[PDB]
From a paper:
To study the structural basis of the alkaline pH optimum, we determined the crystal structures of the [name]/[name] complex at pH 7.0 and 9.0. Upon increase of the pH from 7.0 to 9.0, the Asp232-Oδ2 atom shifts away from MnA2+ and towards MnB2+, and thereby forms an inner-sphere metal coordination interaction with MnB2+ and bridges the manganese ions more symmetrically. The side chain of the nearby Asp234 also moves upon increase of the pH, resulting in a stronger coordination of the Asp234-Oδ1 atom to MnB2+, while coordination of the Asp234-Oδ2 atom to MnB2+ is slightly weakened. These results indicate that the manganese coordination structure of [name] is more symmetrical and forms stronger bonds at pH 9.0 compared to pH 7.0. Although [name] binds in similar fashion in both structures, a clear change in its binding mode is observed upon increase of the pH from 7.0 to 9.0. The boronate anion of [name] is rotated with respect to the manganese ions upon increase of the pH. As a result, the coordination distance of the [name]-O2 atom to MnA2+ has lengthened, while the distance between the [name]-O3 atom and MnA2+ has become shorter at pH 9.0 compared to pH 7.0. Moreover, the [name]-O1 atom adopts a more symmetrical coordination to the manganese cluster at pH 9.0 by shortening of its distance to MnA2+ and lengthening its distance to MnB2+. The more symmetrical coordination of the manganese cluster presumably underlies the increased activity of [name] at higher pH.
[name] is a manganese-dependent metalloenzyme that catalyzes the hydrolysis of L-arginine into L-ornithine and urea. [name] is therefore an attractive target for the development of new drugs for cancer immunotherapy.
Author numbering:
A (entry chain A), B (entry chain A), C (entry chain A): 7 to 319
Write the structure that this text describes.
Amino acid sequence: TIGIIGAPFSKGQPRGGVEEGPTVLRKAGLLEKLKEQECDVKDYGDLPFADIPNDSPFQIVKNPRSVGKASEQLAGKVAEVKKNGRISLVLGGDHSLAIGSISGHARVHPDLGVIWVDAHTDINTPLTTTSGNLHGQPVSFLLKELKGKIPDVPGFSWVTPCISAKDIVYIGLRDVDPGEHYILKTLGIKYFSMTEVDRLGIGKVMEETLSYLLGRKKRPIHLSFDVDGLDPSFTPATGTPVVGGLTYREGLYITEEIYKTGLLSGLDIMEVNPSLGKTPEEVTRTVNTAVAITLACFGLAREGNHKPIDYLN
Amino acid sequence: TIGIIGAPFSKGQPRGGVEEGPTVLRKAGLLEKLKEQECDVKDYGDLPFADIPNDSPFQIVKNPRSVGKASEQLAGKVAEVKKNGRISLVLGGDHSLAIGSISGHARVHPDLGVIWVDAHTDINTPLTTTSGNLHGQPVSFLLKELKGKIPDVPGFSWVTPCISAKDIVYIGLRDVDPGEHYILKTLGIKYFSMTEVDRLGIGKVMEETLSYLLGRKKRPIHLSFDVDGLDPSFTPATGTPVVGGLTYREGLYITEEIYKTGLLSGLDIMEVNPSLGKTPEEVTRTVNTAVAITLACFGLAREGNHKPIDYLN
Amino acid sequence: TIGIIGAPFSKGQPRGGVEEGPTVLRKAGLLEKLKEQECDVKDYGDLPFADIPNDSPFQIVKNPRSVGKASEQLAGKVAEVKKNGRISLVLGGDHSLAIGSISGHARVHPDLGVIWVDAHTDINTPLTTTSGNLHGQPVSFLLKELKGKIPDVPGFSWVTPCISAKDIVYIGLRDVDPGEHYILKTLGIKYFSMTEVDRLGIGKVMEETLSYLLGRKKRPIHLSFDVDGLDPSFTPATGTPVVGGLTYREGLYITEEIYKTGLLSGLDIMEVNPSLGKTPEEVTRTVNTAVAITLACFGLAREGNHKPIDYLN
Ligand SMILES: N[C@@H](CCCC[B-](O)(O)O)C(=O)O
Ligand SMILES: N[C@@H](CCCC[B-](O)(O)O)C(=O)O
Ligand SMILES: N[C@@H](CCCC[B-](O)(O)O)C(=O)O
Ligand SMILES: [Mn+2]
Ligand SMILES: [Mn+2]
Ligand SMILES: [Mn+2]
Ligand SMILES: [Mn+2]
Ligand SMILES: [Mn+2]
Ligand SMILES: [Mn+2]
Ligand code: NA
Ligand code: NA
Ligand code: NA
């Protein structure tokens, strides 16, 4: 069963237009298409994110109270969906929302493991960031090993880090800040940058990823999918594109393999910004790619699908 | 030695323009280019497909008598080419013609094995099809295991199924109807959908394909190549394109490997529809890609080719 | 440490515009970007290539004296840079300059091994060439095994072949003349054509390449990188593009792996011709791709880079 949550929120980064991700994904028939695969799909609507007009930067960190609150609300809504026995599907919205999505999920399933598909590690702290954009920091707020390195940023007093360095795998990396690379190598976080993907192939990547996270014991998976993880030729309508990304095929491979574990528990589909398509067709290409990736998470398979009936009768 | 047969036929599907495939492939210098690799290339011309004006649908199956007859004629012509000791090269034309091409081939070489390169399984029956388009059904007419599930469709009383479920390998699949997936899993047909290609790489795919078909004993290969098996970025001028296809490189890899078996016996180059190019360059890109794939089947190798002489003398 | 040498030279082939490669690569901030990775980057300027007005063809070989001289000068400059303890970085310019670059390098490091990344083998002799273009012949001038097959071509009396057939590996091949293929198979030269890359994946390719060249003993590597080795979709602004090339990812993989050997000693970045971009964006795409490949050679890594400091302090 699936619980859809819309998160029309942009203040984790500078470009307007990402708050429209939930609308365009919905207008592409996401809900109807999902119903062709699972009988029980519940749309919990778009979260009403109140304007927080007074929100001056904390040091260089931008819109901290807005970002913190949006994630707090989202965590509550994800925890509710999880309690209702459903897979949470978060339509973003910028990637700072993963703070809420993962935190909420972890309230119900503290043993979850995270697969983070992104060109970026999104693990800057409030102190290592040079942009101040909170969509480049969510992982730092979630990791137990970093608690004493996160300042008390207004808006985030509610956060309790819910994952260890061992509980996350990165796939797709190709634009990692030096401080983030320091944190990555210091904490021993498991990652498959595009170098690894090139070396091993996406087949070996997914085998290793899933062995790593699930080998010891079965536990819930959280897939946090930044559409910028895919090459700009597939998902151009996004805020921080980086060339040499994952292919459309590789994207579906990742999501097909995750689906087949039967352990998908939470999903974020993040950073679709239709306002940044150069043409109407760049928008449609991005949105269609996002929809495809999503459907694969809930069982659409390139080899085909059939219902348990005799089709020759 | 090579025997070229043109099959300018479209009534297996709705879009006009596929009947022009043989002309554009020929105008690209297919014949001359093939002569740079084999001395003996014989053009048996384009088959004269008579209009069959009275051809109402059989249930929802469209143009059944036209399709059946075109394939009957083609089977005769392929059998003739095979008897003349030549590799048959069928220029399509829509993929329903594979009924004729494979049937004819099998009259001379009943032990043939088929490699089917396509985004689609083309294995709907007259009873499972929802489109009624016969280019989505040819494999169902050919398979022995399905004989009792094919109704007596007008135009096809001449057909005798000539292959078993073990005698075919699919490569490229990514848009398989539920009924087709049922048939695929019921009959135990060997396939490499795009998921498999992604998992294993095209190298392992071709090793497995050829081990599967040829391991027990050497026998003739029939390659039925739907240009929609390649991604629309390579072969856009085709009727049923599906994103996330095989690459140009993968296409040449498949055909290079088949060539090197020395067992290529029949070839179909199908579903080029120049009328569907958005631009002149989409047409040329499609036609050039089709020509490349074809030349690779008869020995053009990316590492290079030389004649048995001393070039430093 | 790095020594940059500009080689604004085009007479190894017919198209003007390649002499501008060094300028556009420099205007893209190549030098500044390299300084973000190594403290000591020295620009030795552009070589002043004097016009040689009287330069009639030798048989069909074009501009032989111009090409020979440009390479002689370049060899001198590379040998100087090498003596100064620096990695030579040659900005081309057409690929005939590899005669000079490799020869110069070998004067200081006779044990070097060459990795040649190209759609072409560039190993025609003055006698096997059909174009007469000297950028299709440089390897033939360098190989010891061919000495008695190279005529005394005006401009090249200074050359002494400095590498054996065992000392070179080709990656990317896909348009090899028959005579070149004869030489390739006769001399037993190690190569990974696009067929091999497709078969094995770029991961296995680089493992095999580097095992082959370095397994016995560590020695200096010379990377001669023709941008036409990458697919025209990545590096369109070049004189002899060939479809089905290496990807942008594969290009960075090759160069990342070479970097990590710590044995990179000489680098050529060749055949960027901005005059051949169909649009300003084709030029920028080509130049940016060339710059990326170069930065990867000197340590820019897709997983990230950090300096030896504590970033959480
Ligand atoms: N590391 C940069 C880029 C972050 C981009 C965030 B993302 O992955 O969600 O698009 C920053 O800290 O601003
Ligand atoms: N399965 C669909 C699509 C078939 C397309 C056929 B083909 O592979 O030859 O393009 C149908 O039965 O119509
Ligand atoms: N083999 C052809 C093409 C050579 C192209 C050279 B190159 O790799 O440097 O672009 C010739 O001899 O002219
Ligand atoms: Mn992100
Ligand atoms: Mn990102
Ligand atoms: Mn087909
Ligand atoms: Mn098809
Ligand atoms: Mn070259
Ligand atoms: Mn070349
Ligand atoms: Na992003
Ligand atoms: Na087709
Ligand atoms: Na070139």
